[PDB]
């Protein structure tokens, strides 16, 4: 089906005979494309070396929240770390965190009983989740939890427990009997990373190297974790200085600002299903003509990527 | 005193370019044809509620209005956002301030940042703990009132400060007039032109 | 021909030269042939 | 005054549904001939104008 | 439109998720965008 | 017991009990990359 326009037509029709006519053809042509990557120029490393190694994490009635910002974020080191007994993620899958890139990231951290780790999931119901650490039902983030029975047990009744991300302080306040001989009654340390995916400028971005920028070819791009397959072309769109991206009538992305050089690129999809094949019957000839729908003839090799065909 | 704000107090809802399109958006907006409380800075700066958010404007020839305060108790029990322009640049803090009995500018801490004939318009909102500021400036030729016409306020700065704000006050240079209105959850239809600029709106 | 007009997206935003697979094909008879 | 024709639209249903994603296009093949019969219907409408 | 997916943008789902969950989120967009096209083509056939 | 395969393969090995979490089709982690990854469309049983 990728051989020639008549083969693309025979495969569009699911037929070896083609009757006389003009046929608007489904794509089938081979689509090689090169990756392109872009992120802001920044050199700080994110403080996970503080957050995951602090001498004591907080009690889960009054958990502590750390803002991560303005840094390169090696989530691959966290995900490779032997320290973590479980590493859930929701709205993101952890392998993608090194390609992905965020405005801020919030780490919430505390100690709980090991059986309570199952309650740290989106919109959960239970005697910790419904009372002092509720996650949103639309939470986008990772939950990282491990037994700390070597660190935090003594038991160690200095560890205590009592809406989404709410904090509150007679009180229902209670203590944990953390002793080394306790399997579910162990202390577990936990960190919860919440990702701020808003369309404002990103500041917390994975250690993935920005490529050179390729215009006028079909590329598999990434700008600040916004990906796509498309041709990039520099454009005359008058972005106001606060605007980072541009959208079509469909609200699909039509343009982007490069984060390293503040030029505006239009995006165009590579496919070009705008091909029609003019044929006499295959009983008359295998000769065809091709109509490239509403393109200028000098632009045809660029419209169809004829060097890759 | 009061005055009726016309089509004023509209702002760019997101950091996205759109052009030659009509876009429906739901957000905290100042309603059209709505009463804003009017105060002279010459011949006061009382405390106001913040409600869901604030539209603030000043009509000027003098730069007497120079800053703002936001918080809950405003008495060092908790963080309070202080914003001042020092006549060279903007300076911002969220410290546990113990403010004066009648605050003015002379002619613990966490977050900090550093950067009638005219009308200066600003919007303050505090969604998800992000204190978002929007801005616009224009010439005018009226001492009494806001102009009957449209211009969209564009982002000044965004601060990830997390304060549970419920109260507000302005700051004046002492040894001009200003207007306060409250934002409300509203659907607006916005008219983005070829230059990606919001040129009109429907409440 | 002046009394019928376009103001649509599109239709006019495409026809005045959108790329989400949608296209407008020309009629076979041009208005000069009609 | 009488209507005689309407605008001959064509929608590339793979680029509408899947927007140049190969991952989506492989999932859209599991729906079989829905996409080719949408293109067939709009082609019949367009030729009829 | 989302059609019940985490995002209406097909490239968000592909840049955020791995294949076992990305295919569940994309299938909501495929189902709703295919229903959106079937609704358009049906009403264009009746209008034609 | 009602079913009849062309071949069956038993993959037999030892790991630490905490890492048994990683032996599933959609899973990821150091077992599920550097030494033993299942297909994301795997048909079969995991016994541990």
How many other CB atoms are there within 10 angstroms of residue D28's CB atom?
21
Task: Report how far residue B115's alpha carbon sits from residue B92's, in angstroms, rounded to the nearest whole number.
Answer: 9
Chain E interface disruption, residue of A79, A96, A102, A205, most E CBs within 10 A:
A96
As for chain B, the residues directly before each break of C–N over 2.5 Å are: 43, 107, 115, 175
Coil, strand, or helix at residue B65? strand
* Chain F contact set for E18 (CB, 8 A): 26, 28
Using CB atoms, which residue from D11, D21, D27 is nearest to E37?
D11
CB distance B177 to B58 below 8 Å: yes
Experimental method: cryo-EM
Please name which of A250, A236, A122, A258 lies closest in space to residue E11, comparing C-alpha atoms: A250
Point out which residues pair with B56 in neighbouring strands: B122, B180
DSSP string, chain A: --S-HHHHHHHHHT-SS--SEEEE----S----EE--B------B-THHHHTT-S-PEETTS-EEEEE-SEE--HHHHHH-TT-SEEEEESS-GGGGGT-EES-EEEEEEEEEGGGGGG-STT--STTTTTT-PPPTT--EEEEEEE-TTTT----TTSEE--TT--------EE----TT--TTSEEEEEEEEE---SSPP-EE-S-PPPPP--SSEEEEEETTEEEEEEEEE------TT--EEE-TTSSEEEEE-SSS--EEEEE-S----EEEEE--TTT-S--EEEETT--GGGHHHHHTTTT-
CB distance A144 to A193 below 8 Å: yes
Task: Report how far residue A92's alpha carbon sits from residue A87's, in angstroms, rounded to the nearest whole number.
Answer: 12
CB distance F34 to A84 below 8 Å: no
How many other CB atoms are there within 10 angstroms of residue E4's CB atom?
10
Listed in sequence order, the residues at least 6 apart from A12 whose beta carbon sits closer than 8 Å to its beta carbon are A23, A24, A25, A26, A28, D36
Chain C interface disruption, residue of B20, B21, B192, most C CBs within 10 A:
B20
Tokens encoding A180: 């080394």
In this structure, what is the dihedral angle of CA atoms D26, E21, E28, A124, given to the nearest 10 degrees? 180
Could A96 and E21 be called an inter-chain contact, meaning their C-beta atoms sit closer than 8 Å? no
Task: For B154, list phi and psi in degrees, rounded to 5.
Answer: -120, 150
* Chain A contact set for D10 (CB, 8 A): 24, 293
CB distance B118 to B146 below 8 Å: no
Coil, strand, or helix at residue B106? strand
CB distance A157 to A190 below 8 Å: no
Chains A, F: CB contacts within 8 A come to: 9
DSSP string, chain B: -EEEE-S---B--SSEE--SEEEEEEEEEPPTTEEEEEEES------EE-TTEEEEEEEESS--EEEEEEESS-SSSS--EEEEE-SSSEEEE-------SS--EE-----EEE---EEEEEEEE-GGG-EEEEEEEEE---SSS--SS---BEEEEEE-------EEEEEEEE--EEEEEE-EEEEEEEEE-TTS-EEEEE-
Task: Report how far residue A247's alpha carbon sits from residue C18's, in angstroms, rounded to the nearest whole number.
Answer: 11
CB distance B70 to B165 below 8 Å: yes
Could F28 and A85 be called an inter-chain contact, meaning their C-beta atoms sit closer than 8 Å? no
C16 vs chain B: nearest CA distance in angstroms?
A: 13
Could E11 and D21 be called an inter-chain contact, meaning their C-beta atoms sit closer than 8 Å? yes
| Sole residue written with tokens 């999931």 | A121
CB distance A121 to A90 below 8 Å: yes
Q: Does A294 touch chain C (CB under 8 A)?
A: yes
Could A237 and B196 be called an inter-chain contact, meaning their C-beta atoms sit closer than 8 Å? yes
* Chain D contact set for E10 (CB, 8 A): 18-19, 21, 24
Task: Report how far residue A274's alpha carbon sits from residue C21's, in angstroms, rounded to the nearest whole number.
Answer: 9
Q: Does A96 touch chain E (CB under 8 A)?
A: yes
Touching status, chains D and B (3+ beta-carbon pairs under 8 Å)? no
In this structure, what is the dihedral angle of CA atoms A82, A86, A89, A90, given to the nearest 10 degrees? 180
Task: Report how far residue A305's alpha carbon sits from residue A295's, in angstroms, rounded to the nearest whole number.
Answer: 13
Listed in sequence order, the residues at least 6 apart from B138 whose beta carbon sits closer than 8 Å to its beta carbon are B118, B119, B121, B147, B151
**How far, CA to CA in Å, does A126 sit from each of A115, A116, A121?**
11, 8, 11
Task: Report how far residue B161's alpha carbon sits from residue B132's, in angstroms, rounded to the nearest whole number.
Answer: 10
Tokens encoding B107: 């002619």
* Angle, CA A13 vertex, CA A9 and CA A15 arms, to 5°: 95
Tokens encoding A260: 């390293």
Coil, strand, or helix at residue D18? helix
Alpha carbon B185 to chain centroid, angstroms: 17
Q: Where are the beta strands (DSSP E) in A38-100?
A: 58-59, 64-68, 71-72, 86-90
C19 vs chain D: nearest CA distance in angstroms?
A: 9
* Per-residue buried b or exposed e for E6-38, using 16+ beta carbons within 10 Å of the residue's own CB: bbbbbbbbbbbbbeebbbebbbebbebbbeebe
**Cα Rg for chain A, rounded, in angstroms?**
28
F18 vs chain A: nearest CA distance in angstroms?
A: 7
B2-203 folds as Jelly Rolls (2.60.120)
Task: Report how far residue D30's alpha carbon sits from residue A32's, in angstroms, rounded to the nearest whole number.
Answer: 23
CB distance D30 to D44 below 8 Å: no
CB distance B134 to B27 below 8 Å: no
Search chain C and give the residue with CA nearest B22.
Answer: C9
Listed in sequence order, the residues at least 6 apart from A32 whose beta carbon sits closer than 8 Å to its beta carbon are A308
Chains A, D: CB contacts within 8 A come to: 28
Listed in sequence order, the residues at least 6 apart from A285 whose beta carbon sits closer than 8 Å to its beta carbon are A279
């Amino acid at each position: 089906c990728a051989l020639d326009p008549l083969s693309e037509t025979k495969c569009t029709l699911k037929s070896f005979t083609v009757e006389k006519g003009i046929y608007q053809t489904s794509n089938f042509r081979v689509q090689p494309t090169e990756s392109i990557v872009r992120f802001p120029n920044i050199t700080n490393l994110c403080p996970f070396g503080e957050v995951f190694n602090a001498t004591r994490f907080a009690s889960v009635y009054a958990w502590n929240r750390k803002r991560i910002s303005n840094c390169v974020a090696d989530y691959s080191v966290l995900y490779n770390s032997a320290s973590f007994s479980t590493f859930k993620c929701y709205g993101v899958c952890p392998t993608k965190l090194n390609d992905l890139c965020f405005t801020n990231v919030y780490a919430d951290s505390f100690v709980i009983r090991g059986d309570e780790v199952r309650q740290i999931a989106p919109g959960q119901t239970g005697k910790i989740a419904d009372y002092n650490y509720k996650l949103p039902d639309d939470f986008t983030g990772c939950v990282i939890a491990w037994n700390s029975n070597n660190l935090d047990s003594k038991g160690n009744y200095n560890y205590l427990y009592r809406k989404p991300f709410e904090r509150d302080i007679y009180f229902p306040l209670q203590s944990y009997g953390f002793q080394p001989t306790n399997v579910g009654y162990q202390p577990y340390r936990v960190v919860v990373l919440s990702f701020e995916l808003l369309h404002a400028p990103a500041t917390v971005c994975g250690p993935k190297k920005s490529t050179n920028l390729v215009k006028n070819k079909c590329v598999n791009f990434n700008f600040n974790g916004l990906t796509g397959t498309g041709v990039l072309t520099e454009s005359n769109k008058k972005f106001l200085p606060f605007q980072q991206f541009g959208r079509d009538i469909a609200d699909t992305t039509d343009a982007v600002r490069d984060p390293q050089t503040l030029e505006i690129l239009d995006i165009t999809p590579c496919s070009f299903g705008g091909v029609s094949v003019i044929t006499p019957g295959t009983n008359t000839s295998n000769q065809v003509a091709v109509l490239y729908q509403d393109v200028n003839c000098t632009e045809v090799p660029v419209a169809i990527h004829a060097d890759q065909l | 005193a009061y005055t009726n704000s016309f089509t004023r107090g509209v702002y760019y809802p997101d950091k996205v370019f759109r052009s030659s399109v009509l876009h429906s958006t739901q957000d905290l907006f100042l309603p059209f044809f709505s009463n804003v409380t009017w105060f002279h800075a010459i011949h006061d700066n009382p405390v106001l509620p913040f409600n869901d958010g604030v539209y603030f404007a000043s009509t000027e020839k003098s730069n007497i209005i120079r800053g703002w305060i936001f918080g809950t108790t405003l008495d060092s029990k908790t963080q309070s956002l202080l914003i001042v322009n020092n006549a060279t640049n903007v300076v911002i803090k969220v410290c546990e301030f113990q403010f004066c009995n009648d605050p003015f500018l002379g002619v613990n801490c966490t977050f900090e940042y550093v950067s009638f004939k005219n009308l200066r318009e600003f919007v303050f909102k505090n969604i998800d703990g992000y204190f978002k500021i929007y801005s616009k400036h224009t010439p005018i030729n009226l001492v009494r009132d806001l102009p009957q016409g449209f211009s969209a306020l564009e982002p000044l700065v965004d601060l990830p400060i997390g304060i549970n704000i419920t109260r507000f006050q302005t700051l004046l240079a002492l040894h001009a007039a200003y207007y306060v209105g409250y934002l409300q959850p509203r659907t607006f239809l916005l008219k983005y032109n070829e230059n990606g600029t919001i040129t009109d709106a429907v409440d | 021909f002046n009394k019928v007009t376009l103001a649509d997206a599109g239709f006019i935003k495409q026809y005045g030269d959108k790329f989400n697979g949608l296209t407008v094909l020309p009629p076979l008879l041009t208005d000069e042939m009609i | 005054i009488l209507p005689v024709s309407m605008t001959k639209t064509s929608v590339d249903c793979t680029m509408y549904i899947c927007g140049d994603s190969t991952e989506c296009s492989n999932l859209l093949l599991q729906y079989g001939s829905f996409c080719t019969q949408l293109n067939r219907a709009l082609t019949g409408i367009a030729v009829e104008q | 439109s989302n059609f019940g997916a985490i995002s209406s943008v097909l490239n968000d789902i592909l840049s955020r998720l791995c294949p076992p969950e990305a295919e569940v989120q994309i299938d909501r967009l495929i189902t709703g965008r295919l229903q959106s096209l079937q609704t358009y083509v049906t009403q264009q056939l009746i209008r034609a």
